[PDB]
Amino acid sequence: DNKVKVAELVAEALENLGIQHAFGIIGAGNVHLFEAIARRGYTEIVCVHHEQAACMAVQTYYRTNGRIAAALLTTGAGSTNGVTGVVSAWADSIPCIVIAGNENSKFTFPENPLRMWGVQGYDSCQMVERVSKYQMRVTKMERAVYELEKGVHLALEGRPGPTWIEIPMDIQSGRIDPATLEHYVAPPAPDYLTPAVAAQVDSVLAALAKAERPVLWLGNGIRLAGGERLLKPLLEKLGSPALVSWAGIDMLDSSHPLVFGRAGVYGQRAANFILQNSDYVLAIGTRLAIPQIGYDLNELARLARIDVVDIDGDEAIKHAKRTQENIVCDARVFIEALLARLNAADAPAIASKADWVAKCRAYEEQFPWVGAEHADPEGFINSYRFMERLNGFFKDDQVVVTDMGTALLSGHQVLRFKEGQRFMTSTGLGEMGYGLPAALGVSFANDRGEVMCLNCDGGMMMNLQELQTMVHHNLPIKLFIFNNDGYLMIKHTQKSLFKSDYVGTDRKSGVSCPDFSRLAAAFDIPAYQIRGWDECDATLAKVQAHTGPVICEVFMHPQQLFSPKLGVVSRTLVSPPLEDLSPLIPRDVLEQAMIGGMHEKSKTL
Amino acid sequence: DNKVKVAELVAEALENLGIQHAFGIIGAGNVHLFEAIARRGYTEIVCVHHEQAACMAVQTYYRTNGRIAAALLTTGAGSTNGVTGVVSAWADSIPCIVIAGNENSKFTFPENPLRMWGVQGYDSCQMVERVSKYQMRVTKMERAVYELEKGVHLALEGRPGPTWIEIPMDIQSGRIDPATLEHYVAPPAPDYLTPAVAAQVDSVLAALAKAERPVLWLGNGIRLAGGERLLKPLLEKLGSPALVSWAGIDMLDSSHPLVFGRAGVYGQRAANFILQNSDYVLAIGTRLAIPQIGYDLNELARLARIDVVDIDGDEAIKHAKRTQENIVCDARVFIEALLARLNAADAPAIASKADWVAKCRAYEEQFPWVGAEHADPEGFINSYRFMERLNGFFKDDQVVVTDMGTALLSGHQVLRFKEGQRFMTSTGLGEMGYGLPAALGVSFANDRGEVMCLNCDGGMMMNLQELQTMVHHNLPIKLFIFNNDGYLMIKHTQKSLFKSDYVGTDRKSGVSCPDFSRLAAAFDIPAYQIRGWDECDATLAKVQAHTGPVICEVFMHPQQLFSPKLGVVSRADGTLVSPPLEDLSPLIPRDVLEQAMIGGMHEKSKTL
Ligand SMILES: Cc1cc2nc3c(=O)[nH]c(=O)nc-3n(C[C@H](O)[C@H](O)[C@H](O)COP(=O)(O)OP(=O)(O)OC[C@H]3O[C@@H](n4cnc5c(N)ncnc54)[C@H](O)[C@@H]3O)c2cc1C
Ligand SMILES: Cc1cc2nc3c(=O)[nH]c(=O)nc-3n(C[C@H](O)[C@H](O)[C@H](O)COP(=O)(O)OP(=O)(O)OC[C@H]3O[C@@H](n4cnc5c(N)ncnc54)[C@H](O)[C@@H]3O)c2cc1C
Ligand SMILES: Cc1ncc(C[n+]2c([C@@](C)(O)C(=O)O)sc(CCOP(=O)(O)OP(=O)(O)O)c2C)c(N)n1
Numbered sequence A: 001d002n003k004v005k006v007a008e009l010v011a012e013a014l015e016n017l018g019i020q021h022a023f024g025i026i027g028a029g030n031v032h033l034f035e036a037i038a039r040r041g042y043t044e045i046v047c048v049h050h051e052q053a054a055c056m057a058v059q060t061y062y063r064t065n066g067r068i069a070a071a072l073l074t075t076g077a078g079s080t081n082g083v084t085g086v087v088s089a090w091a092d093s094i095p096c097i098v099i100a101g102n103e104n105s106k107f108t109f110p111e112n113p114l115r116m117w118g119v120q121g122y123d124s125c126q127m128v129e130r131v132s133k134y135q136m137r138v139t140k141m142e143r144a145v146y147e148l149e150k151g152v153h154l155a156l157e158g159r160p161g162p163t164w165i166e167i168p169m170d171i172q173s174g175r176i177d178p179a180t181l182e183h184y185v186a187p188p189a190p191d192y193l194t195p196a197v198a199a200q201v202d203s204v205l206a207a208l209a210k211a212e213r214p215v216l217w218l219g220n221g222i223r224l225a226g227g228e229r230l231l232k233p234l235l236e237k238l239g240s241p242a243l244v245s246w247a248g249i250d251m252l253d254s255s256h257p258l259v260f261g262r263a264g265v266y267g268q269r270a271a272n273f274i275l276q277n278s279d280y281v282l283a284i285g286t287r288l289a290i291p292q293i294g295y296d297l298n299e300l301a302r303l304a305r306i307d308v309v310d311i312d313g314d315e316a317i318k319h320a321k322r323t324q325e326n327i328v329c330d331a332r333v334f335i336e337a338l339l340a341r342l343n344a345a346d347a348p349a350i351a352s353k354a355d356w357v358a359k360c361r362a363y364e365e366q367f368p369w370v371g372a373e374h375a376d377p378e379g380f381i382n383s384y385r386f387m388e389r390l391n392g393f394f395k396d397d398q399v400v401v402t403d404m405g406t407a408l409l410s411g412h413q414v415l416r417f418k419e420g421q422r423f424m425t426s427t428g429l430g431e432m433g434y435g436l437p438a439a440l441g442v443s444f445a446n447d448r449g450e451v452m453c454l455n456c457d458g459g460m461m462m463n464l465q466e467l468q469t470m471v472h473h474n475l476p477i478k479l480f481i482f483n484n485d486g487y488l489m490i491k492h493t494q495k496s497l498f499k500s501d502y503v504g505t506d507r508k509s510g511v512s513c514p515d516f517s518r519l520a521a522a523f524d525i526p527a528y529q530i531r532g533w534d535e536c537d538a539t540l541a542k543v544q545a546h547t548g549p550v551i552c553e554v555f556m557h558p559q560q561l562f563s564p565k566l567g568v569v570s571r572t573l574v575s576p577p578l579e580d581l582s583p584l585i586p587r588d589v590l591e592q593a594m595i596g597g598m599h600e601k602s603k604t605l
Numbered sequence B: 001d002n003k004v005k006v007a008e009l010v011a012e013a014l015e016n017l018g019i020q021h022a023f024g025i026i027g028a029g030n031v032h033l034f035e036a037i038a039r040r041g042y043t044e045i046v047c048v049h050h051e052q053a054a055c056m057a058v059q060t061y062y063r064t065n066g067r068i069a070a071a072l073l074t075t076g077a078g079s080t081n082g083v084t085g086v087v088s089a090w091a092d093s094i095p096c097i098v099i100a101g102n103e104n105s106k107f108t109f110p111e112n113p114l115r116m117w118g119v120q121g122y123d124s125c126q127m128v129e130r131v132s133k134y135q136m137r138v139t140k141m142e143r144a145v146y147e148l149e150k151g152v153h154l155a156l157e158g159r160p161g162p163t164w165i166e167i168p169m170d171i172q173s174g175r176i177d178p179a180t181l182e183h184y185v186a187p188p189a190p191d192y193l194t195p196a197v198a199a200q201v202d203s204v205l206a207a208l209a210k211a212e213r214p215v216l217w218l219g220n221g222i223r224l225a226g227g228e229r230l231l232k233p234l235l236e237k238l239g240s241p242a243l244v245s246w247a248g249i250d251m252l253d254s255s256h257p258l259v260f261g262r263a264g265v266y267g268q269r270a271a272n273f274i275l276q277n278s279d280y281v282l283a284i285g286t287r288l289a290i291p292q293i294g295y296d297l298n299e300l301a302r303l304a305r306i307d308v309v310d311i312d313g314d315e316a317i318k319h320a321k322r323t324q325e326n327i328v329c330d331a332r333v334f335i336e337a338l339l340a341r342l343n344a345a346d347a348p349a350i351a352s353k354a355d356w357v358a359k360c361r362a363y364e365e366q367f368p369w370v371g372a373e374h375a376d377p378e379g380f381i382n383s384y385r386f387m388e389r390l391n392g393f394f395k396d397d398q399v400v401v402t403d404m405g406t407a408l409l410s411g412h413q414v415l416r417f418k419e420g421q422r423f424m425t426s427t428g429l430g431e432m433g434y435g436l437p438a439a440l441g442v443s444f445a446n447d448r449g450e451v452m453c454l455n456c457d458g459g460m461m462m463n464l465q466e467l468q469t470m471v472h473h474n475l476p477i478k479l480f481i482f483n484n485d486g487y488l489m490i491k492h493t494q495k496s497l498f499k500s501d502y503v504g505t506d507r508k509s510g511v512s513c514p515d516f517s518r519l520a521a522a523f524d525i526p527a528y529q530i531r532g533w534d535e536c537d538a539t540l541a542k543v544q545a546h547t548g549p550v551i552c553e554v555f556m557h558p559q560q561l562f563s564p565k566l567g568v569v570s571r572a573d574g575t576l577v578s579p580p581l582e583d584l585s586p587l588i589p590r591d592v593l594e595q596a597m598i599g600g601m602h603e604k605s606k607t608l
């Protein structure tokens, strides 16, 4: 008998695909796959306590060293519990593969008239049909490996994202002759550099050469394309300033002479003035999302031509009313072509941007990222200043992941990163409870390495249960929890709208959180507190020195403002242009800051 | 100048619909609805810490007192987080309504070529298309209330289920002349009792009058139809023994002289023998799911005719190869129709079933629910024996919810209930982490009332965050946690399949759980531990006496068997036989099985 169990061929296929880690929860629907994978000993199965955490962990796992991980979900609630993680990978263009079990294949077909399949199954492929790149239900044993190979390829192809492969129970346990396995062969990669795309590169170079105040907007699509190592030669060979999106912060040293921060709705004052006063904007590998460009294209860089580079055609033209050259090309290939034309013997002459570069620096001097607006309040540490202090304790290869809330905003508006350091979170979907699972994925991607997790009192609750996963594997995760009596981010929203008592956002309005230090002791986790500046530096040094997991509660003002921020101002109400962040600077100052004078909307504020 | 905010109209609608509780989490996508509901003060918003818990709590909220609740979710992950709750209410035919916000309506159209809508939005309606009864996105302000009234009616009509109404932000904050508000008029309620169905009731009454060994199988569909009070007079009038489905345990007093327990793959030995030796089976409001009838229809009640009553046409005929009368009718309407024909003048004479009833009681004397197979394993408390002991501490108005695992299996195989007591869980989907959200639903339904939650160390983790919601509202939830070093249910599964070391099921194999008494202290929750019989009664009396939340860890053997269980029997050379439904493991001696089966035992059981 030359037949082999399908589950064992699946485990073999995982090793040949380089998948060394799998996150998930066991159940009757995937018990065969757990056994075959565990007995083969190549892929380590990380058991979590909510499938949601499994489909989030696989994202930051890949982002760390570029190796895809698998989420291993069982029938029914095992598959539904993973859907949030699938969407956040879909929204952030992060490749991963879900392997979901299900009832016996005799029940699994859409035409089944009953509400549910078999005992507790459903059509998991239909549920993620609009939030994944590919879904398939293996119905023939001989195709199980075919679909896993295809599932992985489509996840990494083009615009990356999650794929969903469902293998019914009886397909896992069947037996076939290994020579009857079908294998998927990937088609040749597309050659983006066509004559058309070449003429677009030539147009960009022309504009770059002539532009007096250029600004490059660089995004995580460059890293997904594997070209972030070309950014230093490119910036210095152009001499042009550069902004980085929140997702692409770690692609360049925040202290590089030509990198001037991050702009947007929660941008940095210095970075917004840089973008809004430019005469040419080249977006590479950045989605130009609403939090990046505001709420009106006619107010975005009103003196500048805007070109875009993006591997997704639909994302590349979504601003075609405002943009000029919409380049559908891989970010790396595009940067190589642009460098190839800069290094050519017949390269055009690049006019000097020295005055512009000098004006950008002046912007950063007039508007420091942590400024007078961030003063401490009434017996509390200002979360922005704490981030500046905490920044001084990063290790040379530090990795930081954040949840939403204070950690997300204070983090991305302040923290600086060097080469070798990483910054990760989920911004496409922006879901609470992404922090802890994000740390798991990084830690396992670096052989149970260290990860700093900037979290919040609210977001900690969504996936609280993953503290047990953390202690179980003794993961060196340094977990900072910003306590502020509930949903501080929503507090500011409902106050701006209604200017009345809080509703469902603090302890008095129905939302409370536990004492996370008492909780840490229950999990055998060493806990600390930071309430003032006296014990700060000594506390930070001890947290960073621990070998295992640590919790460190950071208490802030229950109503601290998030600023700078592009908010609505009451003149009637007005939505100011991108440059006029709140709290509002004096008009005469803004007038001098704007090359062509302030926007009509600002004059009356 | 004479316009009202749409959100304020929605808040007004919820009061007119009698929705007094709404579970959810706030966010940009539904901040206007939170405001408007709270200002009006009619509907209490309960804030949970994972949207999944809001979509589970609305379920057991309804089943308690028959009042629907809302789930209030927000854009993006606020909606995706609730899907699991939607699917369990879909699988258990439990009504409820989800009101989910979303990005501005100019982004929310399926033709949008981008991966996501606006900032963080998606088509929340498409994602639940196949696991909910109705989904609609409100795109005109004037129909916002129309779709809520429609959603609540569709959730409650026919076979109840969840409905999903999505309202973009800008629709919530919009303002309209209230005169322009459209309202939903429900179509006329169907008349199930047509001449064709009336003829099927006659056929059933003919079979019941003639049958010598009849068995009624009563399910939660009866409760959902509002006809549970008709059961006691029906069984007594017919003199027919009756079984109850796991979900419908609390419809009849378990000690009623004609109620003989629960059958299935995890059924009681006596219940299975009663089912498999009958000559007529009348199933009313029960789905006859795989865990109830086994894996072969041809092996189910091999001496009986089987009739089925169910309001879902698709469920009523799914066993049509084997069943005879497939009656598509509301359960209460059917029972009322059968009671009218029973009490009529021309009602046929009901042949005596006294001998069958006696044989049903001999079965229960021969096979008690807690028997020798439930012996304490080597210095531990057997969960089945703990459930029997725990049963005697139930209050008169006790409500018991369970999670999966030991709480589910040992609870539904041992626990007995009387009128006034309720038993709830999620059996359709069978998701871990249902216990705590369930106890919230019941507690708020009964105005912060007391609830006993039978939970497990593994299942406690899926929604551990809801211990905070329990403390924040001082809900008198009595939380029992069965500790057994991980996923005991799965240990048996992989052991029967692979007969090797555990994988992903206990601490040694990658799955551990915290000390829940030490967490309890962290949440300011009193906690007890029951490791042996010696201190057991004194603890249980303490737990029941508490006025606020309490935790009690119950320690069992990390490899205790779950029995009786219809399970596979394996052989040395790789052979395995799936025995018939009556032949539950651990297998009883063949000579005793032969005498218990009327036509002798099944061929499969002879060589076992
Ligand atoms: C409350 C909030 C506030 C925010 N504020 C800001 C802010 O002030 N400033 C800011 O910059 N961001 C901000 N963000 C984040 C921002 O809105 C986006 O979520 C994202 O982080 C922008 O960075 P990105 O374009 O690199 O990421 P992504 O949105 O993931 O962009 C990746 C893009 O690259 C493309 N791509 C993928 N692979 C390739 C490839 N191989 N070749 C070429 N292109 C490829 C993708 O198609 C996509 O268009 C905020 C988010 C939130 C939730
Ligand atoms: C591991 C496991 C083991 C189990 N073991 C057993 C076991 O041994 N024995 C057992 O009995 N159960 C068992 N169950 C539960 C069983 O499989 C079902 O999930 C269910 O609990 C059986 O009860 P029910 O048919 O009343 O519930 P449901 O499945 O909810 O049945 C409701 C039915 O009534 C219909 N209905 C709804 N409203 C109306 C109305 N107004 N009028 C008429 N009909 C209506 C519905 O369409 C549906 O068909 C087990 C579950 C699990 C997860
Ligand atoms: C799962 C889930 N539920 C709700 C939300 C909505 N939501 C937010 C956003 C970013 O999505 C938003 O509305 O802008 S922000 C937010 C509050 C976060 O509170 P935390 O205590 O975690 O952080 P702080 O705001 O720093 O106190 C919530 C509930 C969300 N993002 N994810």
Ligand SMILES: Cc1ncc(C[n+]2c([C@@](C)(O)C(=O)O)sc(CCOP(=O)(O)OP(=O)(O)O)c2C)c(N)n1
Pocket: A025, A026, A027, A028, A029, A074, A077, A078, A081, B404, B405, B406, B407, B430, B431, B432, B456, B457, B458, B459, B460, B462, B482, B484, B486, B487, B488, B489, B490
């Ligand atoms: C969310 C989720 N994830 C996985 C499962 C699978 N699953 C079960 C079933 C019932 O679905 C099954 O497969 O039969 S049972 C089960 C183990 C539950 O372990 P617990 O420690 O809670 O209970 P005991 O088994 O009594 O120890 C798991 C993981 C599940 N039910 N729900």
Ligand SMILES: [Mg+2]
Pocket: A405, A456, A457, A458, A482, A483, A484, A485, A486, A487, A488, A489
């Ligand atoms: Mg908070």
Ligand SMILES: [Mg+2]
Pocket: B405, B456, B457, B458, B459, B482, B483, B484, B485, B486, B487, B488
């Ligand atoms: Mg367990």
